[PDB]
Amino acid sequence: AEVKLSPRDREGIINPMYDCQPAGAQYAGIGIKDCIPLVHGGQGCTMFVRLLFAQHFKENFDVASTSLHEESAVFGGAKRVEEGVLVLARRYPNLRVIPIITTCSTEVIGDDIEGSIRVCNRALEAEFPDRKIYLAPVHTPSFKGSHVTGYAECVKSVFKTITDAHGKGQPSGKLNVFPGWVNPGDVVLLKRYFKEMDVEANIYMDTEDFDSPMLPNKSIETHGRTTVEDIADSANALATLSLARYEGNTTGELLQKTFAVPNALVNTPYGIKNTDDMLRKIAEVTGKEIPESLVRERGIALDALADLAHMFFANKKVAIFGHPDLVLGLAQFCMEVELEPVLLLIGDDQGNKYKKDPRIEELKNTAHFDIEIVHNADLWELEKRINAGLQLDLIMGHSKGRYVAIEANIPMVRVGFPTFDRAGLYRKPSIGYQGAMELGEMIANAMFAHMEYTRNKEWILNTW
Amino acid sequence: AEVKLSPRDREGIINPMYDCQPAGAQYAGIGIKDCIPLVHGGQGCTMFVRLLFAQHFKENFDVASTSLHEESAVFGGAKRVEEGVLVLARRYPNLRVIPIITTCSTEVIGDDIEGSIRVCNRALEAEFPDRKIYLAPVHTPSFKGSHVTGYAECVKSVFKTITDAHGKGQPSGKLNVFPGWVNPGDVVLLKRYFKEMDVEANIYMDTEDFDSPMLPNKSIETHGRTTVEDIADSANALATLSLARYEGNTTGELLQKTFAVPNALVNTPYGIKNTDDMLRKIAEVTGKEIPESLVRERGIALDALADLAHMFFANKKVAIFGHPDLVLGLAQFCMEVELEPVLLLIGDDQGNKYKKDPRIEELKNTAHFDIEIVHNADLWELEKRINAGLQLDLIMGHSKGRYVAIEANIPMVRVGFPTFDRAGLYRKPSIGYQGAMELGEMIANAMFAHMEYTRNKEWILNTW
Amino acid sequence: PMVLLECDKDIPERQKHIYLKAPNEDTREFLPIANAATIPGTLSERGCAFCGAKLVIGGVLKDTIQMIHGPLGCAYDTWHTKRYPTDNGHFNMKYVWSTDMKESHVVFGGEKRLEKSMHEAFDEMPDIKRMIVYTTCPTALIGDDIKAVAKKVMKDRPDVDVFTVECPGFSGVSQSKGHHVLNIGWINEKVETMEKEITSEYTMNFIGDFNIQGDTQLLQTYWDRLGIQVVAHFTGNGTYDDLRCMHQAQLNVVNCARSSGYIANELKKRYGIPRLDIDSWGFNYMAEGIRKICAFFGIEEKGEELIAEEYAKWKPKLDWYKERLQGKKMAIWTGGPRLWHWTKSVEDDLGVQVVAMSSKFGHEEDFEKVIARGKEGTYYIDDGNELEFFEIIDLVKPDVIFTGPRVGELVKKLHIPYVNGHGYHNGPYMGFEGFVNLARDMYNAVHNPLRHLAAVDIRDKSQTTPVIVRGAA
Ligand code: CLF
Ligand code: CLF
Numbered sequence A, B: 001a002e003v004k005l006s007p008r009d010r011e012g013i014i015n016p017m018y019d020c021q022p023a024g025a026q027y028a029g030i031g032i033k034d035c036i037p038l039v040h041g042g043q044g045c046t047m048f049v050r051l052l053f054a055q056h057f058k059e060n061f062d063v064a065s066t067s068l069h070e071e072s073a074v075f076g077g078a079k080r081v082e083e084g085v086l087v088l089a090r091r092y093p094n095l096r097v098i099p100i101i102t103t104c105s106t107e108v109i110g111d112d113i114e115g116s117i118r119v120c121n122r123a124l125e126a127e128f129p130d131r132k133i134y135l136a137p138v139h140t141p142s143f144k145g146s147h148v149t150g151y152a153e154c155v156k157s158v159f160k161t162i163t164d165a166h167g168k169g170q171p172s173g174k175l176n177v178f179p180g181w182v183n184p185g186d187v188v189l190l191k192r193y194f195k196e197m198d199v200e201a202n203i204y205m206d207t208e209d210f211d212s213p214m215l216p217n218k219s220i221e222t223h224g225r226t227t228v229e230d231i232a233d234s235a236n237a238l239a240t241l242s243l244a245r246y247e248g249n250t251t252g253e254l255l256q257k258t259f260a261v262p263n264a265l266v267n268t269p270y271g272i273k274n275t276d277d278m279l280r281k282i283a284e285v286t287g288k289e290i291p292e293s294l295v296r297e298r299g300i301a302l303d304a305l306a307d308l309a310h311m312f313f314a315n316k317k318v319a320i321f322g323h324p325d326l327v328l329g330l331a332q333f334c335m336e337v338e339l340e341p342v343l344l345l346i347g348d349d350q351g352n353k354y355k356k357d358p359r360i361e362e363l364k365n366t367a368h369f370d371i372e373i374v375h376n377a378d379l380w381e382l383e384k385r386i387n388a389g390l391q392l393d394l395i396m397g398h399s400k401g402r403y404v405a406i407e408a409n410i411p412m413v414r415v416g417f418p419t420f421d422r423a424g425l426y427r428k429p430s431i432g433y434q435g436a437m438e439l440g441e442m443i444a445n446a447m448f449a450h451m452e453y454t455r456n457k458e459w460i461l462n463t464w
Numbered sequence C: 001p002m003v004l005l006e007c008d009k010d011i012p013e014r015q016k017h018i019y020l021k022a023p024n025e026d027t028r029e030f031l032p033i034a035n036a037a038t039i040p041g042t043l044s045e046r047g048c049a050f051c052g053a054k055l056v057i058g059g060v061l062k063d064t065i066q067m068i069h070g071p072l073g074c075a076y077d078t079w080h081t082k083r084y085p086t087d088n089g090h091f092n093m094k095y096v097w098s099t100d101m102k103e104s105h106v107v108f109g110g111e112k113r114l115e116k117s118m119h120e121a122f123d124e125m126p127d128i129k130r131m132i133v134y135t136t137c138p139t140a141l142i143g144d145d146i147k148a149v150a151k152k153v154m155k156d157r158p159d160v161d162v163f164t165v166e167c168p169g170f171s172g173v174s175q176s177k178g179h180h181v182l183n184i185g186w187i188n189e190k191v192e193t194m195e196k197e198i199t200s201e202y203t204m205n206f207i208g209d210f211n212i213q214g215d216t217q218l219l220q221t222y223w224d225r226l227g228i229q230v231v232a233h234f235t236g237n238g239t240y241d242d243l244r245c246m247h248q249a250q251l252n253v254v255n256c257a258r259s260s261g262y263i264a265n266e267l268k269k270r271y272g273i274p275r276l277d278i279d280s281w282g283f284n285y286m287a288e289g290i291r292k293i294c295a296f297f298g299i300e301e302k303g304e305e306l307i308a309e310e311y312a313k314w315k316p317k318l319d320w321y322k323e324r325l326q327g328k329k330m331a332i333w334t335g336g337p338r339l340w341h342w343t344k345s346v347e348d349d350l351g352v353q354v355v356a357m358s359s360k361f362g363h364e365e366d367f368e369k370v371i372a373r374g375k376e377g378t379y380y381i382d383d384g385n386e387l388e389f390f391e392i393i394d395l396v397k398p399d400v401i402f403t404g405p406r407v408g409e410l411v412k413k414l415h416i417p418y419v420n421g422h423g424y425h426n427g428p429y430m431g432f433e434g435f436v437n438l439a440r441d442m443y444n445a446v447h448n449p450l451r452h453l454a455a456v457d458i459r460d461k462s463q464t465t466p467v468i469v470r471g472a473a
């Protein structure tokens, strides 16, 4: 049967799937301890993204603007960047890292960000001779790529900046791990996996503490845990495990080229097989055995999914949208549980890469139903297909697609980013064995509630 | 404002909230390693309960019947007990414990269970010289109490039997913990709390492995983990912590009277305060400090619940049904999050006890809205009150109430036993700090889906 | 006096933006500079001019394509973020449109890309016949002539009408410039291009209300009761064509004088339509507004009947909340106008003391109003930033803060509850019923067990866990 790749047939967008590159660069930066990204452009480019992160996480994250105004848009914005760096340093005495993120406006007018960084480094060295602030140029014009590409670009620039400063030294015995754009609950699960395997690793970025407590001492703990030192130590790792081709593998490639740290790109670990293959690669690189505890967690997940697959999932048609690593990985997970992912939507201009993704051939060789993969897609592409008569049983995607599912009376599982219209999702893993279990149970529970509300054999939920 | 206790006003039952005593005794017994309960009565008394456990857990549990037939109804059933014990012992060489559970039939006809036990002990001693099988008489007429009472009775009888055999030994340094009738996920949570507090404890019964894996070697691991040796060591504990007045406290009282192990009954740990008070009690009896990790889990819970309480929960009217310890505990949790539990239903004839429960006073002094507590309730009492015009925003209860909520179009969170009409609930904690957070989130998500299906301000789920 | 906060020692220009009102001062000597440039790198709360045009005003309309000529981010960022329902299924909140600008368009121009996108949008939704096109940062910089494109599209598509707004984000210093450009362009290009049937002796426009959680729909129940025809709402639950008829009204009633005073002023100048400023938040304020409207039209008795009925319905609940909120301290950290709409109404009707106020983008006019109505001992902050908010919390110790959700989530860590001062918690908040709704949310936010629980350190042997008693009106 056939997996066909097709582009959106319209020039414009209705209902964008992703945000722009600068938004993704901000997301990368907020995972770094003692980091406040500085977004060089107009004020909206900062404030709307701070809101987006508050929608997903229900937390505040600090990001600053250079406040480009009309004078700077006409005569150049270098002084706004320079002033913003100094104002951050003067008011935030613990600040260590400032990714300086460009926008459409400051790409169009040609501001020389590397020049402004030289100016700022001299000014900071003179004003604060006992501090070191790392200024990383992040070139993220919004008229290319998407937040996915901006995330990858920011990670790569920040690693290049920090590792250029420190270089290679003592071998650390640790893995570098780039999970991509995942939730705090994903990072929790990976930390547990590595602990149970006795494998030391740094996870870039460590966003576990984004789910921060309300504490009796009123302290604010909502910070990235990845430090300058952690980043610098990437040059000394045993190996890099890159879980996401479009969300950090290019940093693993840079560390391989610069420092001879071997990069191992694996399929993103959605579902059982992809998790098995990630653990096999960890055991190969480290020489550590996979522990019994993971065989058990695997087995618990399979037991749970088996209570659902042939009863409730078989032959049910699914559309999936989100980040490309998530879409392709979830399509593989869906087929393990007898779902039929017939429509996959990926939301940016990177189709020349997607066509060469090995997971497309892996789908070609396991699917018994046609699959349409729309690249450069917007969410109108989904809604239009449903209007034209595509029969879906389930949608998997982020919350900005909610009205499509609501109006079409299709159950929808919230995955990826942002998931603002349900509570607690950022805490639940989607990757790994526990994550496959949790995803499968969310799917069933969404279907079950839909059978009740629609009175569709609701009586059947007794002795399954 | 008044908290009023009233009985069901009808003689008959429509839609019973609980099963009978022997079903609870069975539940107790299946948590013991190398235990097969023997239910002395007709065949339905076993088979229907084995089905009920398969509905809740999606697992098989071994329980045998004495297969009472017409001859035994005329002449007595003792020979059926005695044959059943031997046939179990002959065919299950690793069997160690057989609670012999009576039913309505065998209570009415007066079979002498203790006499049959003497016969069987002699026969087993002669036939299996190197084996010890513990036969516990469990008197559970179905025409009083309920499965709550039967669980309590079975735990007590088993404990009496095994501790009578072994007596008091060397101090263990451990706590005995009776959590009552809780899910595997609740047991997982308590194990974690004790580990984080460096408190050694036996949790009776340890049902974590009811959520068993599907393993490459095809092994069956769906067993209780509480062993004979663990029960016998109860006599040597430092203290007993009883979390459920109606579900195990009487065994903590037995161990206090017999072996001078001091019993501390605390409120069942639904919500924040009750969990706080539990942990304070543990600290007091063990002299161990509450760890920072628990302060942080509490704070994460609080932070999650604060995203919900005043926005979505305040002034919303709730009905709760289930076991008495769960209903009273959940009512307290609801009030912490600004829900209004206006109707509490408790499903058995133990009203004379419930009128003395200190948590009723705790409600009487905290509530600002009238609360009706209906004891000896059935689920028709909920339906009838809705039909007469009680306005509810939420129901919390077990799955046998599902059609009340479905037909009334009221969102329902599944708690307690059995929760067969949603996937995976047995693995999610409801007690503790993590449990409070998960309950709160389930509530919110149920509300959110309801808003979508009913088009009730569904646009509001964006920037909360 | 003007205040130099500790966190501002290195940006001492902030002193001119922060007033602490003290006894006997001539307030004329202490008016914060407002509507000035933002200081880079401060974590100012300000947004951009495009936001003020598309998100705040234009996007409220129920029947109009919102075509954002720019790269995709500006569109993504203004979608799923507002709470302005309609009576047509919330078309306005379900969709956003972009021209998806790419590098080729930056280099060689984006006018054809815009043209094609506009035709596509009209083709994909053939029932929708109205559109607003907005420029964004890059499309303004490259000089695309969107007015010309729109005239070509209207020639090719006689069924449509298109309005254009040149409002890149870097224009002005905040959202405010977007308001201004939209207002002045709409009066100049679209008012007086259509008429509608007049069905009442009494006609008004209601200017500067954006139907947050149904505020406009709630107020409409008053106008229907009074027999007054609203020619146009600017722009809550509104239509593009209603706004083309605004010159027909006898009276302009203004709530948001900040965003929408411009058009009221121009309608007065051009057409002679008087401008009436009211407060549509606040219980006693709403009665004053209805009495002024009715005095203008000579329908005083009708207004008294409405007011008497609403007081009988809602005043007892309001007073219940007042008894329990009296003396609580509040901060308001919003765009600007709500500070002057709310400082004295919460004091008069709920007994609440507003101790700190911050405006993202208010003008000096808005400070004149807020300082006139506000208390001594209160801080008045223009273009506040995050560190300042922490210092102000230390100084005034609020019981509740009305602000946006991200700031709400930050101050939660300090055990300070919030109410969403922008999108509301459980609104609407305008009118009589709405002030009761506001009060309820404030009460539930402050009288919340979770706050007391969060203070308890379970490791402290001297501490127990409290039980708090609440109430309900
Ligand atoms: S201040 Fe305002 S929101 Fe910013 S760009 Fe300018 S009009 Fe728009 Fe747009 S695509 Fe992304 S979000 Fe920006 S970098 Fe450009
Ligand atoms: S074999 Fe059949 S199901 Fe059994 S009792 Fe007899 S008719 Fe009934 Fe009833 S109440 Fe419980 S389940 Fe029993 S112990 Fe009595």
Ligand SMILES: [Mg+2]
Pocket: A303, A304, B057, B058, B059, B211, B212
């Ligand atoms: Mg199972």
Ligand SMILES: [Mg+2]
Pocket: A057, A058, A059, A211, A212, B303, B304
């Ligand atoms: Mg949080």
